[PDB]
Symmetry: C5
Subunit: 69 residues, 5 copies
């Protein structure tokens, strides 16, 4: 799966349908994997660099692969 965006997490958002949105760089992407919620919030809290990999690389696109650095 191609890299879509790499950077620090600007904000995260818990959505009404229980998906989780993350803003990295200039993209706002969402995931429906519940396990990723606290992992992404910890990446945000500790200033990690995340690389989100997704084919839906556009605002509102979904993802399920993340590298935490």
């Amino acid at each position: 799966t191609p890299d879509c965006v790499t950077g620090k997490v600007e904000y995260t958002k818990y959505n009404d349908d229980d998906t989780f949105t993350v803003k990295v760089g200039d993209k706002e992407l969402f995931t429906n994997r519940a396990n990723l919620q606290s992992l992404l919030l910890s990446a945000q809290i500790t200033g990690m660099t995340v690389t989100i990999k997704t084919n839906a690389c556009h605002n509102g696109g979904g993802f399920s692969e993340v590298i935490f650095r």
Copy 2:
């Protein structure tokens, strides 16, 4: 969903019916989404700014959308 309140978490409360109350600004709101409990406690512990979005924007109102900054 309209923004209801933005600020640092003043306190959180685990309720008898397993819902979770959060006080931000001047509003005391609650959520019944279990996944939000440790996310909101981490936001409190690390001094994050949260924006709670809800139509029930009054004390005792329920919510399910939160932005963590």
Copy 3:
């Protein structure tokens, strides 16, 4: 539900029947709500003030309402 005790957590204890004991002030109380286990350990780790509300306000009393400050 009346306030029972307010203070910093002195210690927590995982019990054999999977309940969780917390000592605050001079009271040793327990809860059977699994969700409260890591929330109370985080309150302990970060020096939060907790207020336990319970009618069973005596050693060995059970509780399910907590304010984290």
Copy 4:
């Protein structure tokens, strides 16, 4: 249940059968309670003193009661 060992956690180990081993003092003990895994890792990360209570107080013994201080 008698106290078996008190001290800081020297290391923890995730085992193939999903049990979790902890070394405190001179004893290597294990637990099969999934809830204790992240609680014990947090106790290790923050230098807490833990008291493991168990009748099987010997290397390889199992436990389910822990005091976190």
Copy 5:
């Protein structure tokens, strides 16, 4: 099970099939044990030394035993 690699976690990766990859030393290994995801991310965040034990000691090998130091 033989030791495969010991060192600090260079990065972790959440995979599309919900397995979790970790890079330690020169090996990239994965686990399918969901419980290990946040334990390994905490080990990464706090600079722990981990020893991964596995017979599949090669890139892309799977593991289920980890010592956290």
